[PDB]
Amino acid sequence: GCPXQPWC
């Protein structure tokens, strides 16, 4: 899911 991802 987002946020939580390095390029989100």
Provide CB contacts within 8 A for 8, sequence distance 6+: 2
- Contact between 8 and 1 under an 8 Å Cβ cutoff? The reply is no
Pull the structure tokens for residue 6: 């390095």
The structure was resolved experimentally with NMR
Task: Please tell me the distance from the alpha carbon of residue 7 to that of residue 1, in angstroms, as a whole number.
Answer: 12
Q: How many helices (H) and strands (E) does the chain have?
A: 0, 0
